[PDB]
């Protein structure tokens, strides 16, 4: 039966159970044949699939859809035995997430789905047929796969021509290879985002050749050493260079040729000195340089040479002072200096009339310059664990200040003029409860009355 009916997954029974089957065969083989289905894993699997379809009705999946950070319909499947066929009846679904689903098969009925754009295959080996594979080759934008072995990734990944984003979160470091498995990335010439996370030691040649048309490349080695040796010069049009936890320990010399970069981050790269800003003058589109979670003794005086800085970050560093030339760039909007060993802020920061968000948490700033409050375009000011005894009385002239935090500070006085602002609610100003009671209550009722909506 297991060789004729393709139910080959019927293990032979042992003693005292084979004998009864032989007796039944001597009486009638039909009883044995009909009882044989319950001993096959295939029948159990398809019964599980049918029970999943009956249980996971259309309404349940419809209600289970969520909104992701990217503001699109998303569905998350966790530890499920399979994909219910009622899932593919949600034409409005756009993002599908699969995690720890064993032996997952994508039916052609996925072509019924139309809004689907992102696929998440976390530790799942996906088997797809020809029509569904064509449907994915035509109507799939982003792909997320998590794995620990090379083999468990889909072998048809390179067959998806219209893919735009790829997310690898596995261990591609195989046995003394130049990352052969990912070498198929040359097939996908339409790729925009590559999210390799495999603790790279050397940048694969495939990535170097494919980055000439890549837009957002993020690599996370989790502190594993990374070496360039002129590997960023091949790319000419890349804009994002996330190098989180790649153990650079120094700013690479291959980044200078990428003048088209706009967003750069070097978090947890064990940097020592960043005096190479003079080599970043070639980058006239560099506006989002991020250097937090690093070890910088002091900021070079070469920041003032650049003027295009819009998003600057040097958080979680040990810098004793901020040179005034850094304030020359007037177009900063998201400059944040949190967890820094700073002593005081120069008054030149008051010329940053275009700044929006500034985070000065965990800073030993004794006083705030009155010149800084002269700007009116400030949007966010975060102050946590700072050496402050009082708040300047000229903050009341601010009207565009959306939010401000004073947590962890040993303040004792809240000026009254703070209470007059067109844009001020309870969520915007969060401070200590005891410090909140020092202000006159007549405006508290007015504010709380408008806190509803």
């Amino acid at each position: 039966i297991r060789e004729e009916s393709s139910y080959s997954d019927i293990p032979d029974v042992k003693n005292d159970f084979a004998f009864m089957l032989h007796l039944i065969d001597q009486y009638d083989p039909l009883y044995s044949k009909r009882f044989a289905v319950f001993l096959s894993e295939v029948s159990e699997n398809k019964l599980r699939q049918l029970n999943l379809n009956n249980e996971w009705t259309l309404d349940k999946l419809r209600q289970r859809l969520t909104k992701n950070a990217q503001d699109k319909l998303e569905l998350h499947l966790f530890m499920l035995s399979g994909i219910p066929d009622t899932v593919f009846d949600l034409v409005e679904l756009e993002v599908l997430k699969l995690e720890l689903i064993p032996d997952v098969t994508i039916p052609p009925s996925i072509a019924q789905l139309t809004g689907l754009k992102e696929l998440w295959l976390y530790h799942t080996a996906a088997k797809i047929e020809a029509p569904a594979l064509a449907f994915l080759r035509e109507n799939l934008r982003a792909l997320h796969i998590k794995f620990t072995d090379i083999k468990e990734i889909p072998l048809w990944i390179y067959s998806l021509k219209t893919l735009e984003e790829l997310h690898l979160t596995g261990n591609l470091s195989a046995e003394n290879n130049r990352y052969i498995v990912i070498d198929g990335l040359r097939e996908l010439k339409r790729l925009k985002v590559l999210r390799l996370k495999s603790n790279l030691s050397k940048l694969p040649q495939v990535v170097t050749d494919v980055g000439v048309h890549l837009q957002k490349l993020s690599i996370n080695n989790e502190g594993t050493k990374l070496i360039v040796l002129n590997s960023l010069k091949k790319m000419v049009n890349l804009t994002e260079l996330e190098l989180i936890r790649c153990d650079l320990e120094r700013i690479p010399h291959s980044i200078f040729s990428l003048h088209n970069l706009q967003e750069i981050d070097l978090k947890d790269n064990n940097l020592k000195t960043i005096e190479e800003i003079i080599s970043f003058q070639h980058l006239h589109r560099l506006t989002c340089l991020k250097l937090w979670y690093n070890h910088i003794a002091y900021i070079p005086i070469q920041i003032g040479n650049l003027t295009n800085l819009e998003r600057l970050y040097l958080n979680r560093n040990k810098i004793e002072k901020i040179p005034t030339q850094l304030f020359y760039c007037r177009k900063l909007r998201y400059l944040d200096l949190s967890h820094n060993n700073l002593t005081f802020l120069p008054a030149d920061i008051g010329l940053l009339q275009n700044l929006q968000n500034l985070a000065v948490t965990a800073n030993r700033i004794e006083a705030l310059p009155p010149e800084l409050f002269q700007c009116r375009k400030l949007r966010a000011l975060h102050l946590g664990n700072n050496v402050l005894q009082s708040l300047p009385s000229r903050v009341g002239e601010l009207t565009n200040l959306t939010q401000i935090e004073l947590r962890g500070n040993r303040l004792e006085c809240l000026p009254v003029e703070l209470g007059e602002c067109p844009l001020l609610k309870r969520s915007g100003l969060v401070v200590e409860e005891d410090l909140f009671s020092t202000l006159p209550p007549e405006v508290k009722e007015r504010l709380w009355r408008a806190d509803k909506e």
Partner: nanobody
Framework: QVQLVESGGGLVQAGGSLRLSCAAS???????WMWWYRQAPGKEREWVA?????????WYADSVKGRFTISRDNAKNTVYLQMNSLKPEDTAVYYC??????????????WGQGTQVTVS
């Protein structure tokens, strides 16, 4: 179905000219972005030659750049690779690799049988 067979692989003294050929299947040679791979003994399999569909652009690794010429020939569904003056490091086993199938039914990737070439 879809299958590929290597041919032309053989031992040859250094400096000779070799023309590896592949016999393909129902998938178009004009389509079906194609690879010529090598596996070296005492080493890991590494890609050598790449021929693309819709433009016929050639890709090579730096170690195999300069003295290897790959092409795809239609009306006979063949992939050819010429190596001139092969060095001793060329001793390996060469396969034809299909990473993208034809226009329709987009069948899974299949590895070639392979032929062993040796340089003395």
């Amino acid at each position: 179905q879809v299958q590929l067979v290597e041919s032309g692989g053989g031992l040859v003294q250094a400096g000779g000219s070799l023309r590896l050929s592949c016999a393909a299947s129902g998938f178009p040679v004009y389509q079906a972005w194609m690879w010529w791979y090598r596996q070296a003994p005492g080493k890991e399999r590494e890609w050598v030659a790449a021929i693309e569909s819709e433009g016929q652009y050639t890709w090579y690794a730096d170690s195999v750049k300069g003295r290897f010429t790959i092409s795809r020939d239609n009306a006979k569904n063949t992939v050819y690779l010429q190596m001139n003056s092969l060095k001793p490091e060329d001793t390996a086993v060469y396969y034809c690799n299909v990473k993208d199938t034809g226009h329709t039914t987009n069948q899974y990737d299949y590895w070639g049988q392979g032929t062993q070439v040796t340089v003395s």
